[PDB]
C-alpha cells in the first residue's frame, strides 16, 4: 500500500511544469519527491506485486527512456535527466511533461494491477 502512495505522488508528475521542472525536480527528486517516489514506487511494485506482469510493467517503465533519459533518471538527481532538462526548459516541460503524463498512464495499468493483487488478498 505504501508503495502505491509513492506512485500516487507520480500523479503530480503528470502535471509537472517548466518552472517546477528546474525546482520541482530538485524537490520532486528529494525526500518524498514525487519524481523520486515515482521511480521508487515503481521499484516497490517490481517486488511489491505478486504478478510478473506488475514487475514487467514496472520494470519496462523503470527501463523506459523518459524525455530521452531513463525513467530511473527522472526519479533522482545527478542523473542524465538533470542534464536533459539543463538543455530543454520550455520545450522539455512541454514534451517531457507530455511524456511524463503518458508515463503515469502506463503506471496506472501496473498500479491497478498491484491493487488487484493486494485487493484480492481481501
DSSP one-letter string for the chain: -HHHHHHHHHHHHTT--HHHHHTHHHHHTSTT-HHHHHHHHHHHHHTT-SSHHHHHHHHHHHTSEETTEEGGGTTSSSSHHHHHHHH-SHHHHHHHHHHHHHHHHHHHHHHHHHHHHHHHT-
Q: Which structural technique was applied?
A: NMR
For the record, the C-alpha cell of 72 comes out as 530511473
Measure the CA dihedral 5/36/18/108, to 10°: -40
Q: Which CATH architecture has domain 1-122?
A: Up-down Bundle (1.20)
Amino acid at each position: 500500500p505504501m508503495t502505491l502512495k509513492g506512485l500516487d505522488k507520480a500523479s503530480e508528475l503528470a502535471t509537472l511544469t517548466p518552472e517546477g521542472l528546474a525546482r520541482e525536480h530538485s524537490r520532486l527528486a528529494s525526500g518524498d519527491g514525487a519524481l523520486r517516489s515515482l521511480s521508487t514506487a515503481l521499484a516497490g511494485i517490481r517486488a511489491g506485486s505478486q504478478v510478473e506482469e506488475s514487475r514487467i510493467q514496472a520494470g519496462r517503465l523503470l527501463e523506459r527512456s523518459i524525455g530521452g533519459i531513463a525513467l530511473q533518471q527522472w526519479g533522482t538527481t545527478g542523473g542524465a535527466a538533470s542534464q536533459l532538462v539543463l538543455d530543454a526548459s520550455p520545450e522539455l516541460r512541454r514534451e517531457i511533461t507530455d511524456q511524463l503524463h503518458q508515463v503515469m498512464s502506463e503506471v496506472a495499468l501496473l498500479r491497478q494491477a498491484v491493487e488487484s493483487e493486494v485487493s484480492r488478498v481481501s
